[PDB]
Amino acid sequence: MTAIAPVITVDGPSGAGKGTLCKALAESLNWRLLDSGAIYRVLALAALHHQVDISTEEALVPLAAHLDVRFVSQNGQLQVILEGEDVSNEIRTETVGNTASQAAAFPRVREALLRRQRAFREAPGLIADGRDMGTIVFPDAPVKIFLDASSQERAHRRMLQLQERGFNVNFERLLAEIQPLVPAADALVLDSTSMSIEQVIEQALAYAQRILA
C-alpha cells in the first residue's frame, strides 16, 4: 500500500545517473535503498565465499531467497553489506560480475532474487534502483521514474569509471561498444543528457512529494 511503505522506482540504462539519483533521493527522504545491479553481484559473492556449485541452481535458490544483504548510503557513497561484512569493493571485480551473469541465467534464481528484492519494501519507504523495477518488481509503485541518457553520455560516464579502476579506455571504442528495458506507462521520463544531476533530483523529489503527500 502507498502509505505504510511507499516505493519510488527508478529505471533506466547504466550510466545515466540512476545510482546517483537513487542515493540522493534515499538520503533526502531518509528511506531504504535497493540497488538491483548490486544484488546480483552480492549473490555471486555469497556464492564464491561459501564456494557452492554454480550449475544445477539447487543451492543458489535458497541463497538468493534469504540473501543477507543491505544497502546503506551516507554522504553520496554506496555501502554494501553482506552477512555483516562491508563488501562494497569486492562486488565490483570482474570475476564477481561474471559469476553474477552465471547465476542470473537460471529462472528459479531470478524468481528467488525477485522475491528477495520485493522484501526490501519496508517503512518508511523504499528507493528501488533497477531496470524493470516499475514494470515487474513493483508494478503498483506510487512513483515511477525512467532516467535515460544518450550513448555518448553513458559512454563518458563508463570511461571515467573504467579509468578510476585503472584501465585506459578509448572513448570511441567504448561509445561504439555501448552503441528488456522500457519505461513503465506511468513513468516520469527524465533525460540527464543536457540536464544537471541536481535538476534531475529536484524534479524527482518534487514529483514524488506531490503524489505521496
Residue numbers in the entry: 1 to 179, 192 to 225
Please share excerpts from the published article on this structure.
Cytidine monophosphate (CMP) kinase is a member of the nucleoside monophosphate (NMP) kinase family, and plays a crucial role in biosynthesis of nucleoside precursors. In bacteria, CMP kinase catalyses the transfer of a phosphoryl group from ATP to CMP or dCMP. We have elucidated the crystal structure of CMP kinase from Y. pseudotuberculosis and validated the function of the enzyme as a kinase. Yersinia CMP kinase adopts the same overall fold as related CMP kinases and is composed of nine α-helices and seven β-strands connected by loops.
There is one CMP kinase molecule in the crystallographic asymmetric unit, and the solvent content is 48 per cent. Clear density is observed from Met1 through Ala225 with the exception of a 12-residue gap from Glu180 to Ala191. The central portion of the molecule is composed of a central β-sheet, made up from β1, β2, β5, β6 and β7, and α1 and α9. The NMP-binding domain is composed of anti-parallel β-strands (β3 and β4) and helices (α2, α3, α4 and α5). Yersinia CMP kinase can be described as a member of the class of long-NMP kinases owing to the insert found in the NMP-binding domain, which is not present in short variants: in this structure, the insert comprises the anti-parallel β-strands, a loop region that connects β4 to β4, and α5. The lid domain is composed of helices α7 and α8. The ligand-binding site is formed by a pocket on the NMP-binding domain. One sulphate ion is bound at this site. The sulphate ion occupies the same position as that of previously published bacterial CMP kinase structures that have been crystallized in the absence of ATP.
